[PDB]
Amino acid sequence: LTFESTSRFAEVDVDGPLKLHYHEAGVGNDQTVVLLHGGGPGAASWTNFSRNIAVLARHFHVLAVDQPGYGHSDKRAEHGQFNRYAAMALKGLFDQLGLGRVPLVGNALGGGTAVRFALDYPARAGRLVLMGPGGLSINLFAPDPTEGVKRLSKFSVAPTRENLEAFLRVMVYDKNLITPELVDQRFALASTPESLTATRAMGKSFAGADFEAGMMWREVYRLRQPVLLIWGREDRVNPLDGALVALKTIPRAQLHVFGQCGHWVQVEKFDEFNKLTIEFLG
Amino acid sequence: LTFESTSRFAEVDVDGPLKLHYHEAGVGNDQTVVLLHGGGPGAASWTNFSRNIAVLARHFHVLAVDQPGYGHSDKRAEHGQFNRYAAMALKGLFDQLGLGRVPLVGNALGGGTAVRFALDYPARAGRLVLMGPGGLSINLFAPDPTEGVKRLSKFSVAPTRENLEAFLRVMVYDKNLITPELVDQRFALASTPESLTATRAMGKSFAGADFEAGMMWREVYRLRQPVLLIWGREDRVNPLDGALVALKTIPRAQLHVFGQCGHWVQVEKFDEFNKLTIEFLG
C-alpha cells in the first residue's frame, strides 16, 4: 500500500465545489471506517496514520480523508466554524460514495470534526474512536490556550523552522521522535502559501459568530452510540482533564489513557491503539 | 429579630396568583440582598438561615424568600422545571417590590434558582454567592443520584421519621448536629399533606420536557458578574467535583472550599460564611 496506490479525489458541495483528497484501502472488506487526522499545519492523512492505515486495512474498508485546509484537499481562505465546515464536506462525501452509517476515527482537530458530524448528522455516524479530541473537550484545570495551542499560534504568526520544531516537540512524550528529517518534511508542507492561508482561517473561526458549534462539550450528552475516548497521559495540546465532561455525559462512553504517551496517540502507542480500535469496531 | 417581626406576604403572577412568604430585615440599609434556601422537605428560610439573617441584617437589607413549595409559600401540585418556575416567581416579586439589580445568595436548590434567575433575567441579578448549588453543578466523578439525593427520594416514597433522620445525617459533617429535636421539628413540617404534594412535583419536573433548563452547567459561561462558589469538602448531596465546570466557565468566578464541612455550609461554618459573604457583597 502506497500513497499513490491509495490516492483518491472527490468533488462535493459546500457553498460550492470543494475538492477532497483521501486514501482508500481494504476494498472488499465489509465494514467501512473513516479516519480524520490531526490539525498540525503540515499534517495530512497519510502522515498522520502511516503506522495505522495498513493495519486497519486488514480488517476494514479504510477511507482516510484529508480535511479541508490540509494535505491535498482544497484550502479555502474563508469558512465558518471549522469543525462544522469540515463536517459539511464529510456529509457531501458520504452522500457521493453511498455511505450510510459509518464509524469514525479522529484525532485532535479531526476528533472535533467527527463529533460535530455525529451531532449535526446524527443518523450518519456509527461508533466513534476519538484520540485527544478537540471540540468535545474542555480543560477544567489547564489554563487556555495550552502550551500546545500557544506554540501553534506562534508558528502561524512567525512560520520558521525553529518555531515549528518547538511545536512538534510538545506533540510527543518521547521527544526523540522529533528528528531533523521530520522537522524539515513538516516545515516544507507547513510554510507553503496554501498552508499559511489555511491556518489563519482556522484559528480565527473558533471565534466568529457561530463559536458555539465548537463548544461541543455542551452537546455530547445527545450522542447515543458507543464512544471510545483515547488519551495520552502527557498530552500537552488537549490535556487529560479535557476528557472529563465527555466521559461523564456520553451515556455509552469509555476512556483509555496511556501513560508515557503524548498528543500523537496513534504514533507513540500505535500497537495498542490499533488493537483497541479493531476490537471496539469489531 | 423574630420569625414574627420579619414575616411578609406577597402575591405575584406565575400562570396565575401565587403566594410567596418571606422574611425582611435590615430595612434602611442601602443595599438589598435576597436569600434563597435549600431544598429539604421541611426546609424554610427562617430555619435555613437563622445563624445568618440577623448578622447580614447589620449590613444589608435582607429579603429571605420561601421558595414555591416550601415554608409558607404556595405549594402547587404542578409546575414546570422547578428552578425556572421559582425564577418566574422571584421575577414577580422583584417587579412588585421595585427591585432593580440585586445580589443573590442561594444554597443547594436555592442556588439553582439564583442561577436560573440570573440566566433568564440577566439584567435583574447582581453578584451571586452559591453554596453547594444545584443546577450549575455536574458531578464529574460521583455516580448520580448521589447518596444525599437518594436518601431524599426514599423519604418521599416512604415519609417516616427513620428515613428523614437518615437524610438529615448526610447533610452535615458533624452528625451530632442532627438532634432528636431537629429531627422531630423537620419531620412535623415534612410529612404534612402540603409538603408531600410539593416534594413529588419537584423531583419529577427535573425530567419533564423542559429538562434542559436544569442543566445550567451548559449556560453559566454567559454570566458576566462576579460569582462566589462556596462548598463543603464533605458535601454528600452536591459533591465538590460538581464545582468544576462552573469554576472553569464563569469568567469572574471564585471558589472557597471549607474542610470539615458538609452540605449545610451556612450552618457548620456560619462565621466564616457570614464574613465571606459580607466582604464579597461589600
XYZ file of all heavy atoms in Angstrom, chain B residues 131-208:
591
model
N -23.895 28.317 47.598
C -23.331 27.289 48.476
C -23.840 25.912 48.074
O -25.046 25.666 48.071
C -23.671 27.585 49.952
C -23.393 28.999 50.391
S -24.802 30.126 50.133
C -25.732 29.800 51.651
N -22.905 24.989 47.764
C -23.258 23.688 47.245
C -24.460 23.706 46.306
O -25.406 22.924 46.481
N -24.437 24.606 45.323
C -25.547 24.846 44.439
C -25.919 23.707 43.497
O -25.049 22.995 42.987
C -25.088 26.036 43.608
C -23.622 25.940 43.625
C -23.270 25.436 44.979
N -27.205 23.546 43.272
C -27.699 22.605 42.282
C -27.794 23.343 40.955
O -27.569 24.542 40.888
N -28.143 22.617 39.893
C -28.321 23.243 38.590
C -27.046 23.529 37.821
O -26.850 22.961 36.751
N -26.210 24.413 38.330
C -24.964 24.733 37.648
C -23.893 23.672 37.923
O -22.822 23.704 37.333
C -24.465 26.152 37.957
C -23.846 26.583 39.281
C -23.026 25.509 39.915
C -23.010 27.820 39.079
N -24.221 22.726 38.789
C -23.303 21.643 39.111
C -23.546 20.398 38.289
O -24.677 20.046 37.989
C -23.394 21.296 40.616
O -24.713 20.998 41.013
N -22.442 19.736 37.917
C -22.495 18.456 37.249
C -21.408 17.605 37.864
O -20.233 18.005 37.855
C -22.273 18.582 35.701
C -22.163 17.185 35.101
C -21.065 19.408 35.402
C -22.392 17.131 33.629
N -21.778 16.499 38.468
C -20.859 15.667 39.236
C -19.943 14.821 38.346
O -20.260 13.690 38.029
C -21.627 14.758 40.200
C -22.599 15.554 41.065
O -22.290 16.665 41.478
N -23.757 14.990 41.332
N -18.814 15.377 37.968
C -17.928 14.689 37.015
C -17.446 13.306 37.466
O -17.151 12.461 36.626
C -16.749 15.570 36.646
C -17.243 16.857 35.902
C -16.071 17.725 35.539
C -18.050 16.536 34.666
N -17.365 13.088 38.781
C -16.870 11.791 39.291
C -17.906 10.963 40.066
O -17.905 9.731 39.982
C -15.612 12.008 40.133
C -14.400 12.507 39.310
C -13.984 13.806 39.402
C -13.734 11.646 38.485
C -12.925 14.271 38.673
C -12.646 12.109 37.732
C -12.240 13.425 37.845
N -18.778 11.619 40.827
C -19.747 10.890 41.664
C -20.911 10.328 40.860
O -21.557 11.056 40.096
C -20.278 11.796 42.778
N -21.195 9.013 41.030
C -22.360 8.457 40.326
C -23.640 9.114 40.811
O -23.788 9.425 41.988
C -22.312 6.970 40.742
C -20.862 6.723 41.015
C -20.369 7.986 41.641
N -24.574 9.342 39.885
C -25.845 10.004 40.196
C -26.960 8.952 40.142
O -26.907 8.055 39.309
C -26.155 11.101 39.142
C -25.297 12.321 39.310
O -25.304 12.938 40.395
O -24.608 12.735 38.297
N -27.953 9.052 41.032
C -28.119 10.049 42.067
C -27.127 9.800 43.179
O -26.819 8.628 43.430
C -29.536 9.734 42.656
C -30.010 8.530 41.976
C -28.933 7.943 41.146
N -26.615 10.866 43.774
C -25.725 10.762 44.935
C -26.475 10.213 46.132
O -27.724 10.106 46.125
C -25.183 12.144 45.310
O -26.280 13.011 45.683
C -24.423 12.779 44.158
N -25.735 9.905 47.165
C -26.315 9.399 48.419
C -27.352 10.372 48.949
O -28.460 9.973 49.302
C -25.177 9.167 49.431
C -25.668 8.601 50.742
C -24.516 8.299 51.687
O -23.395 8.774 51.413
O -24.772 7.602 52.678
N -27.019 11.649 49.012
C -27.963 12.654 49.506
C -29.263 12.716 48.723
O -30.363 12.824 49.273
N -29.162 12.681 47.388
C -30.339 12.676 46.552
C -31.129 11.399 46.749
O -32.360 11.448 46.822
C -29.973 12.856 45.073
C -31.177 12.596 44.168
C -29.472 14.278 44.842
N -30.449 10.265 46.863
C -31.137 9.003 47.065
C -31.926 8.987 48.352
O -33.074 8.506 48.393
C -30.185 7.807 46.981
C -29.787 7.423 45.545
C -29.324 5.966 45.465
C -27.956 5.748 46.060
N -27.621 4.287 46.096
N -31.306 9.475 49.396
C -31.971 9.472 50.685
C -33.187 10.399 50.728
O -34.141 10.149 51.481
C -30.960 9.802 51.820
C -29.879 8.712 51.974
C -29.311 8.666 53.378
N -28.319 7.587 53.520
C -28.591 6.377 53.991
N -29.817 6.065 54.380
N -27.623 5.473 54.089
N -33.209 11.533 49.937
C -34.385 12.391 49.782
C -35.497 11.648 49.036
O -36.654 11.673 49.459
C -34.006 13.698 49.074
C -35.133 14.669 48.668
C -36.072 14.926 49.811
C -34.561 15.987 48.160
N -35.150 10.986 47.941
C -36.124 10.183 47.189
C -36.786 9.108 48.051
O -37.979 8.832 47.910
C -35.476 9.536 45.962
O -34.981 10.527 45.079
N -36.029 8.489 48.937
C -36.553 7.439 49.797
C -37.559 7.966 50.796
O -38.588 7.338 51.046
C -35.444 6.690 50.516
C -35.968 5.632 51.457
C -34.941 4.591 51.756
C -35.608 3.301 52.220
N -34.766 2.565 53.175
N -37.261 9.115 51.388
C -38.219 9.756 52.274
C -39.505 10.135 51.550
O -40.589 9.985 52.106
C -37.646 10.998 52.942
C -38.671 11.763 53.733
C -39.041 11.329 55.001
C -39.273 12.889 53.228
C -39.997 12.030 55.731
C -40.212 13.589 53.948
C -40.583 13.149 55.206
N -39.386 10.648 50.324
C -40.573 10.987 49.528
C -41.449 9.764 49.293
O -42.672 9.850 49.337
C -40.180 11.601 48.193
O -39.356 12.745 48.387
N -40.822 8.626 49.040
C -41.554 7.396 48.787
C -42.099 6.834 50.091
O -43.190 6.280 50.135
C -40.674 6.337 48.072
C -41.279 4.959 48.217
C -40.505 6.683 46.606
N -41.335 6.997 51.173
C -41.707 6.444 52.469
C -41.415 7.446 53.590
O -40.381 7.388 54.225
C -40.954 5.138 52.715
N -42.356 8.398 53.811
C -42.126 9.538 54.703
C -42.158 9.182 56.193
O -43.088 9.590 56.880
C -43.294 10.486 54.362
C -43.949 9.914 53.124
C -43.662 8.462 53.148
N -41.165 8.477 56.668
C -41.049 8.112 58.085
C -40.020 8.912 58.853
O -39.098 9.410 58.272
C -40.693 6.654 58.239
O -39.406 6.422 57.735
C -41.627 5.800 57.462
N -40.162 9.000 60.171
C -39.115 9.645 60.994
C -37.746 9.008 60.784
O -36.777 9.707 60.769
C -39.464 9.675 62.465
C -38.607 10.582 63.313
C -38.768 10.373 64.818
N -37.942 11.260 65.629
C -36.682 11.046 65.977
N -36.052 9.984 65.571
N -36.051 11.914 66.710
N -37.696 7.694 60.614
C -36.433 6.990 60.384
C -35.779 7.446 59.094
O -34.582 7.760 59.083
C -36.664 5.468 60.336
C -35.576 4.647 61.007
C -35.678 3.133 60.743
O -36.766 2.651 60.374
O -34.655 2.423 60.905
N -36.511 7.480 58.004
C -35.928 7.854 56.750
C -35.533 9.331 56.704
O -34.609 9.692 56.001
C -36.892 7.495 55.582
C -36.985 6.037 55.366
O -36.083 5.317 55.680
N -38.090 5.593 54.884
N -36.242 10.184 57.425
C -35.884 11.583 57.447
C -34.578 11.787 58.227
O -33.722 12.468 57.790
C -36.985 12.428 58.052
C -36.651 13.889 58.014
C -36.661 14.456 56.670
C -37.459 14.657 58.870
N -34.438 11.141 59.393
C -33.170 11.194 60.128
C -31.998 10.768 59.259
O -30.987 11.428 59.242
C -33.229 10.363 61.434
C -31.880 10.344 62.166
C -32.003 9.921 63.638
O -33.059 9.390 64.047
O -31.033 10.118 64.377
N -32.152 9.683 58.502
C -31.076 9.222 57.604
C -30.671 10.280 56.574
O -29.462 10.431 56.286
C -31.486 7.940 56.903
N -31.667 10.971 56.027
C -31.453 12.088 55.070
C -30.701 13.236 55.741
O -29.724 13.734 55.218
C -32.778 12.594 54.530
C -32.672 13.898 53.790
C -32.121 13.946 52.515
C -33.145 15.075 54.357
C -32.031 15.150 51.825
C -33.049 16.278 53.675
C -32.481 16.314 52.405
N -31.172 13.644 56.922
C -30.555 14.770 57.606
C -29.093 14.499 57.930
O -28.271 15.396 57.885
C -31.341 15.093 58.896
C -32.701 15.765 58.652
C -33.479 15.829 59.945
C -32.539 17.156 58.055
N -28.774 13.240 58.240
C -27.412 12.876 58.653
C -26.369 12.976 57.548
O -25.163 13.064 57.830
C -27.380 11.482 59.278
C -28.013 11.429 60.673
C -28.229 10.010 61.130
N -26.957 9.333 61.393
C -26.198 9.575 62.460
N -26.575 10.475 63.361
N -25.062 8.920 62.617
N -26.819 12.944 56.280
C -25.871 13.186 55.189
C -25.895 14.633 54.716
O -25.354 14.947 53.660
C -26.091 12.228 53.992
C -25.715 10.789 54.386
C -27.507 12.299 53.501
N -26.516 15.519 55.491
C -26.457 16.971 55.208
C -25.281 17.651 55.884
O -24.937 18.783 55.513
C -27.721 17.690 55.712
C -29.045 17.253 55.095
S -29.154 17.548 53.293
C -28.857 15.895 52.739
N -24.699 16.994 56.881
C -23.646 17.622 57.719
C -22.447 16.708 57.868
O -22.541 15.501 57.724
C -24.178 17.953 59.147
C -25.155 19.161 59.120
C -24.826 16.737 59.787
N -21.276 17.317 58.179
C -20.091 16.593 58.529
C -20.163 16.123 59.988
O -19.953 14.939 60.303
C -18.840 17.516 58.333
C -17.527 16.886 58.746
C -16.968 15.842 58.012
C -16.813 17.345 59.857
C -15.776 15.277 58.366
C -15.616 16.783 60.218
C -15.095 15.749 59.463
O -13.902 15.174 59.801
N -20.510 17.060 60.876
C -20.676 16.754 62.300
C -22.074 16.233 62.552
O -22.998 17.007 62.774
C -20.428 18.003 63.136
C -20.496 17.729 64.625
O -20.765 16.565 65.024
O -20.305 18.693 65.406
N -22.215 14.925 62.512
C -23.562 14.313 62.637
C -24.219 14.584 63.988
O -25.388 14.354 64.158
C -23.482 12.799 62.374
C -23.164 12.477 60.880
C -23.186 10.984 60.660
C -22.390 10.586 59.454
N -22.425 9.108 59.243
N -23.456 15.091 64.939
C -24.011 15.487 66.227
C -24.977 16.658 66.106
O -25.746 16.916 67.030
C -22.890 15.857 67.224
C -22.183 14.629 67.789
O -22.668 13.504 67.668
N -21.027 14.852 68.396
N -24.955 17.353 64.981
C -25.914 18.448 64.758
C -27.338 17.896 64.524
O -28.304 18.625 64.664
C -25.496 19.300 63.555
C -24.222 20.127 63.734
C -23.704 20.606 62.374
C -24.507 21.313 64.640
N -27.421 16.623 64.175
C -28.723 16.002 63.938
C -29.300 15.477 65.278
O -29.172 14.297 65.593
C -28.641 14.860 62.898
C -27.927 15.330 61.620
C -30.059 14.364 62.525
C -28.400 16.643 61.104
N -29.937 16.382 66.020
C -30.505 16.060 67.344
C -31.936 15.514 67.229
O -32.558 15.692 66.205
C -30.544 17.321 68.210
O -31.257 18.353 67.540
C -29.107 17.829 68.491
N -32.422 14.853 68.290
C -33.836 14.405 68.285
C -34.774 15.566 68.039
O -35.797 15.408 67.381
C -34.043 13.869 69.701
C -32.683 13.475 70.192
C -31.698 14.400 69.503
N -34.455 16.733 68.589
C -35.328 17.897 68.427
C -35.384 18.413 66.990
O -36.417 18.801 66.496
C -34.899 19.025 69.366
C -35.085 18.706 70.830
C -33.906 17.991 71.437
O -32.938 17.682 70.717
O -33.947 17.739 72.655
N -34.218 18.438 66.315
C -34.167 18.874 64.928
C -34.908 17.885 64.028
O -35.670 18.281 63.180
C -32.699 19.001 64.449
C -32.581 19.336 62.949
C -33.164 20.705 62.697
C -31.146 19.287 62.480
N -34.648 16.580 64.250
C -35.372 15.544 63.511
C -36.897 15.684 63.643
O -37.611 15.652 62.649
C -34.914 14.124 63.938
C -35.742 13.075 63.221
C -33.411 13.941 63.612
N -37.384 15.850 64.877
C -38.827 15.931 65.097
C -39.437 17.172 64.464
O -40.486 17.114 63.829
C -39.162 15.887 66.601
C -38.813 14.554 67.247
O -38.757 13.519 66.545
O -38.597 14.545 68.460
N -38.768 18.318 64.649
C -39.263 19.580 64.071
C -39.375 19.500 62.551
O -40.387 19.840 61.978
C -38.360 20.743 64.484
C -38.888 22.121 64.085
C -38.366 22.608 62.742
O -37.498 21.985 62.132
N -38.890 23.741 62.277
N -38.271 18.965 61.912
C -38.272 18.843 60.456
C -39.343 17.839 60.000
O -40.017 18.069 59.042
C -36.895 18.435 59.955
C -35.805 19.511 60.114
C -36.022 20.647 59.133
N -34.798 21.432 58.896
C -34.303 22.320 59.749
N -34.921 22.543 60.887
N -33.192 22.987 59.455
N -39.487 16.787 60.725
C -40.460 15.746 60.360
C -41.887 16.256 60.393
O -42.689 15.890 59.545
C -40.318 14.510 61.248
C -41.209 13.352 60.829
C -41.000 12.712 59.617
C -42.257 12.927 61.636
C -41.799 11.660 59.221
C -43.064 11.886 61.239
C -42.843 11.245 60.043
N -42.209 17.067 61.392
C -43.587 17.586 61.519
C -43.942 18.477 60.343
O -45.095 18.543 59.913
C -43.754 18.331 62.833
N -42.931 19.189 59.820
C -43.165 20.042 58.646
C -43.142 19.240 57.348
O -43.888 19.518 56.421
C -42.081 21.142 58.582
C -42.002 22.027 59.834
C -40.788 22.941 59.787
C -43.299 22.841 59.994
N -42.271 18.231 57.303
C -42.006 17.499 56.055
C -43.056 16.454 55.714
O -43.170 16.065 54.551
C -40.617 16.844 56.121
N -43.827 16.048 56.699
C -44.737 14.938 56.465
C -46.199 15.411 56.330
O -47.058 14.616 56.175
C -44.589 13.845 57.520
O -44.811 14.349 58.810
N -46.422 16.713 56.377
C -47.749 17.241 56.210
C -48.242 16.972 54.784
O -47.456 16.608 53.909
C -47.827 18.748 56.466
O -47.167 19.447 55.408
C -47.192 19.089 57.808
N -49.542 17.142 54.568
C -50.123 16.934 53.249
C -49.512 17.873 52.208
O -49.116 17.394 51.149
C -51.604 17.277 53.476
C -51.831 16.963 54.885
C -50.574 17.350 55.599
N -49.424 19.156 52.520
C -48.831 20.124 51.568
C -47.419 19.752 51.122
O -47.088 19.841 49.948
C -48.786 21.524 52.168
C -49.922 21.892 53.040
C -49.691 21.478 54.464
O -50.000 20.329 54.774
O -49.193 22.294 55.253
N -46.563 19.350 52.083
C -45.186 19.084 51.765
C -45.003 17.861 50.892
O -44.171 17.865 49.987
C -44.348 18.976 53.033
O -44.227 20.249 53.633
N -45.789 16.827 51.150
C -45.709 15.627 50.351
C -46.134 15.984 48.907
O -45.507 15.564 47.958
C -46.589 14.536 50.948
C -46.008 13.907 52.227
C -46.436 12.469 52.394
C -44.505 13.999 52.216
N -47.173 16.783 48.788
C -47.637 17.279 47.491
C -46.486 17.950 46.744
O -46.183 17.614 45.607
C -48.755 18.311 47.662
O -49.940 17.672 48.143
C -49.059 18.981 46.345
N -45.842 18.904 47.403
C -44.745 19.653 46.815
C -43.568 18.785 46.406
O -43.107 18.850 45.277
C -44.282 20.715 47.768
N -43.075 17.980 47.335
C -41.879 17.190 47.048
C -42.046 16.402 45.762
O -41.222 16.507 44.857
C -41.515 16.251 48.225
O -42.658 15.469 48.577
C -41.084 17.058 49.419
N -43.098 15.631 45.672
C -43.367 14.857 44.484
C -43.091 15.715 43.268
O -42.156 15.476 42.496
C -44.847 14.438 44.485
C -45.336 13.880 43.172
C -44.741 12.510 42.910
N -45.309 11.889 41.722
C -44.590 11.330 40.762
N -43.271 11.313 40.850
N -45.193 10.789 39.712
N -43.943 16.725 43.099
C -43.848 17.639 41.979
C -42.428 18.034 41.617
O -42.108 18.130 40.436
C -44.692 18.868 42.257
N -41.573 18.269 42.613
C -40.218 18.766 42.334
C -39.275 17.797 41.645
O -38.678 18.131 40.633
C -39.557 19.332 43.585
C -38.220 20.002 43.308
S -36.793 18.886 43.587
C -36.777 18.763 45.379
N -39.120 16.605 42.201
C -38.190 15.633 41.638
C -38.564 15.291 40.213
O -37.710 15.212 39.336
N -39.865 15.086 39.992
C -40.386 14.730 38.684
C -40.152 15.727 37.545
O -39.802 15.355 36.430
C -41.907 14.639 38.765
C -42.612 15.925 38.354
C -43.903 15.638 37.617
C -44.971 15.097 38.550
N -46.058 16.093 38.800
N -40.357 17.005 37.847
C -40.106 18.080 36.906
C -38.672 18.188 36.398
O -38.428 18.854 35.393
C -40.526 19.411 37.525
O -39.630 19.806 38.535
N -37.716 17.557 37.077
C -36.337 17.641 36.619
C -36.283 16.837 35.337
O -35.318 16.918 34.605
C -35.291 17.172 37.690
C -34.710 18.316 38.512
C -35.461 18.941 39.473
C -33.425 18.796 38.269
C -34.949 19.991 40.186
C -32.928 19.846 38.956
C -33.689 20.448 39.921
N -37.351 16.071 35.081
C -37.457 15.250 33.896
C -38.801 15.391 33.177
O -39.477 14.406 32.905
C -37.240 13.831 34.246
N -39.205 16.605 32.881
C -40.422 16.812 32.137
C -39.995 16.928 30.707
O -39.306 16.086 30.228
